[PDB]
Amino acid sequence: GLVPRGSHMPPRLQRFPASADEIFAAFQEDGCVVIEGFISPEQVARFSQEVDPAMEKIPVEVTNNGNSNDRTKRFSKCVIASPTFRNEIIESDLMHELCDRVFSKPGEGMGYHFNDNMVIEVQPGAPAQRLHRDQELYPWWNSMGPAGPECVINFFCAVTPFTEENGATRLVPGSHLWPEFTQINERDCPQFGKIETVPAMQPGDCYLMSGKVIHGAGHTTTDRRRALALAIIRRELRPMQAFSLSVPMKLAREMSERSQTMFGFRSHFWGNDGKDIAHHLGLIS
Amino acid sequence: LVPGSHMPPRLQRFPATASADEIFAAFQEDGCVVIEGFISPEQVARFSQEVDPAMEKIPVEVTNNSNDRTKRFSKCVIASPTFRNEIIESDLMHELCDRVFSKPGEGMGYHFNDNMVIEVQPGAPAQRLHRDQELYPWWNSMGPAGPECVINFFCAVTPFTEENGATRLVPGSHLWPEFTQINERDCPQFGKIETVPAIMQPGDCYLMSGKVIHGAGHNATTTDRRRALALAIIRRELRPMQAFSLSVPMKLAREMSERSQTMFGFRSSVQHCVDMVHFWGNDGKDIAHHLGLI
Ligand SMILES: C=C1[C@@]2(C)C[C@H]3[C@]4(C)CCC(=O)OC(C)(C)[C@H]4CC[C@]3(C)[C@]1(C(=O)OC)C(=O)[C@@](C)(O)C2=O
Ligand SMILES: O=C(O)CCC(=O)C(=O)O
Ligand SMILES: O=C(O)CCC(=O)C(=O)O
Numbered sequence: 001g002l003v004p005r006g007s008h009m010p011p012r013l014q015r016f017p018a019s020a021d022e023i024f025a026a027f028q029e030d031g032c033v034v035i036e037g038f039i040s041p042e043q044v045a046r047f048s049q050e051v052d053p054a055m056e057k058i059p060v061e062v063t064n065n066g067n068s069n070d071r072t073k074r075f076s077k078c079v080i081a082s083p084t085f086r087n088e089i090i091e092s093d094l095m096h097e098l099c100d101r102v103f104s105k106p107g108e109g110m111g112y113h114f115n116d117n118m119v120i121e122v123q124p125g126a127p128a129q130r131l132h133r134d135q136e137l138y139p140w141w142n143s144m145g146p147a148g149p150e151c152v153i154n155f156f157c158a159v160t161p162f163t164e165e166n167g168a169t170r171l172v173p174g175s176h177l178w179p180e181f182t183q184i185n186e187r188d189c190p191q192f193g194k195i196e197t198v199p200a201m202q203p204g205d206c207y208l209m210s211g212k213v214i215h216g217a218g219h220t221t222t223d224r225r226r227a228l229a230l231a232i233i234r235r236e237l238r239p240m241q242a243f244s245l246s247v248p249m250k251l252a253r254e255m256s257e258r259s260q261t262m263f264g265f266r267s268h269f270w271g272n273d274g275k276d277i278a279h280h281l282g283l284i285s
Numbered sequence: 286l287v288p289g290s291h292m293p294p295r296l297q298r299f300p301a302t303a304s305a306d307e308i309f310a311a312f313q314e315d316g317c318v319v320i321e322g323f324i325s326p327e328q329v330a331r332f333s334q335e336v337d338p339a340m341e342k343i344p345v346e347v348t349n350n351s352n353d354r355t356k357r358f359s360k361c362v363i364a365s366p367t368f369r370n371e372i373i374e375s376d377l378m379h380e381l382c383d384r385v386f387s388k389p390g391e392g393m394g395y396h397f398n399d400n401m402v403i404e405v406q407p408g409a410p411a412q413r414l415h416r417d418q419e420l421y422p423w424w425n426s427m428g429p430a431g432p433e434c435v436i437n438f439f440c441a442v443t444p445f446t447e448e449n450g451a452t453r454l455v456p457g458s459h460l461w462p463e464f465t466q467i468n469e470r471d472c473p474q475f476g477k478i479e480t481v482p483a484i485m486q487p488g489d490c491y492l493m494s495g496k497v498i499h500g501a502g503h504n505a506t507t508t509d510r511r512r513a514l515a516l517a518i519i520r521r522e523l524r525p526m527q528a529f530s531l532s533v534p535m536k537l538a539r540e541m542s543e544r545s546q547t548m549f550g551f552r553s554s555v556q557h558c559v560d561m562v563h564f565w566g567n568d569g570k571d572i573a574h575h576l577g578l579i
């Protein structure tokens with residue numbers, strides 16, 4: 001009795017809070033999974049107010065030009081601005097546990113690192129964001145289709161509530177197993193206009209979405225719908241943010257060894273002439 | 286030439302004063318091409334002298350087996366004024382990199398993977414045959430329809446001869462219908478692949494696609510330490526082997542041209558997907574602001 005009997009059933013979106021191989025199997029089969037309470041409630045609020053002065057100093061473009069900055073606020077300096085983010089959020093042992101299952105190969109250590117730490121605030125009345133796969137950032141990845149390896153995963157967590165009215169992200173579970181990965185355009189996508197989405201949540205909930213999954217933010221009067229994006233890429237890919245050049249050394253000295261690897265203060269990709277870059281940085285005892 | 290003697294594959298050769306389009310077509314048909322005089326003999330010789338102290342402090346690893354007896358040094362910008370002020374400012378290098386990597390309206394499509402002096406010691410065993418894009422392990426699966434991951438300007442610092450271990454290359458292997466690793470399990474041509482040495486004088490280089498099968502040769506000499514300079518260049522979305530922006534000092538970065546700063550990640554480049562996004566950037570701006578490079 002999930003939908004009234006005889007109905008069209010809409011694409012499945014499982015939900016967990018919880019065993020790791022369990023949530024991974026839901027990730028594999030559907031491409032998207034809600035993780036209710038990825039961050040503790042006081043933590044999400046401790047973080048949200050912590051960055052609210054940064055967010056307050058971001059002007060809103062009323063552009064009507066169709067891009068992803070049209071009435072949507074975006075801010076990446078979450079490690080400087082928020083001690084909660086860098087000391088608590090970035091240290092979820094289940095996040096690494098899932099990252100290690102999507103990305104790492106055994107005996108090769110950590111196969112992943114951060115792409116971005118973005119806070120995305122859909123300002124009230126914003127056009128819907130164009131449908132896209134996150135792996136379009138790495139433009140050849142679609143050409144490998146669903147047999148290709150994973151490019152990117154986003155732990156996309158709600159900061160303020162995600163409702164079907166304020167602009168919550170619309171997911172297309174199963175778009176990671178389609179046979180051809182295209183740009184989602186009428187010219188390029190044979191299924192344009194017929195793509196069935198599901199809107200994605202309360203503060204503290206994440207959703208782990210594969211980079212192969214089609215999605216977008218949707219279109220109220222006062223609701224600043226705010227989210228925290230933990231985009232994570234394999235170690236061979238380059239990050240959107242030059243974190244080891246903007247995050248001060250002081251904060252990097254406070255990070256765990258694994259979090260230093262996430263931001264590229266530690267490494268052989270991204271090495272230093274056969275040595276770990278962390279030697280030259282004064283980070284190895 | 287040879288006498289009904291079997292004719293082995295050609296490696297096209299051009300001088301550094303040929304037109305980039307002439308050299309790129311050769312690169313395009315064969316996946317590799319020799320640029321003679323890529324670096325002047327006086328530039329090569331100053332570079333070799335400027336890094337030689339660092340090469341002398343590198344021990345020769347001899348093992349009981351695995352690509353030993355090869356010295357590898359990547360701190361070229363730090364050690365060599367000639368390298369940073371001149372070698373990396375080759376306009377021919379950048380002309381060709383744009384033709385491979387740069388997309389319309391997006392600026393530089395490429396940056397440095399590595400800057401490696403590679404000195405094959407006397408008696409060093411030959412290197413396994415490989416493609417350089419194997420470093421990005423998924424790339425072979427796109428086959429020859431795929432885009433370029435990586436290219437290398439592989440420069441003779443000292444002469445390349447067949448005896449001292451000049452690289453063995455396989456022209457046209459960037460066009461085989463299936464890109465596998467070169468082993469008995471996966472490669473059906475295994476043990477049947479015909480290679481060709483890159484015979485070069487100092488300052489010559491060959492430019493080679495990451496799709497081309499190749500390996501360092503056996504250094505069968507008793508005396509010759511065969512020195513090379515590998516300028517490996519990747520597209521902007523790929524991670525470098527070297528964290529250049531974290532070991533190269535800022536004093537050296539402020540002296541770099543803007544295209545050099547981009548190569549080493551002291552500066553960002555703009556990517557378009559209807560949307561524009563700085564790659565390797567800082568919260569919407571070039572990282573060169575926060576670093577103080579204008
Ligand atoms: C330009 C953009 C790109 C190319 C990248 C993208 C990206 C890093 C990619 C997906 C990912 O892994 O992480 C997150 C969630 C952090 C996003 C954040 C937003 C941006 C920076 C972007 C943008 O802000 O446009 C000015 C977009 O909104 C979008 C979707 O069009 C893009 O694909
Ligand atoms: O803002 C959102 O809800 C979706 C985030 C997203 O799709 C992106 O910008 O990559
Ligand atoms: O040194 C050589 O001749 C070949 C080296 C090489 O091909 C490599 O390191 O990928």
Ligand SMILES: [Fe+3]
Nearest residue numbers: 132133134215
């Ligand atoms: Fe997205």
Ligand SMILES: [Fe+3]
Nearest residue numbers: 415416417499
């Ligand atoms: Fe090689």
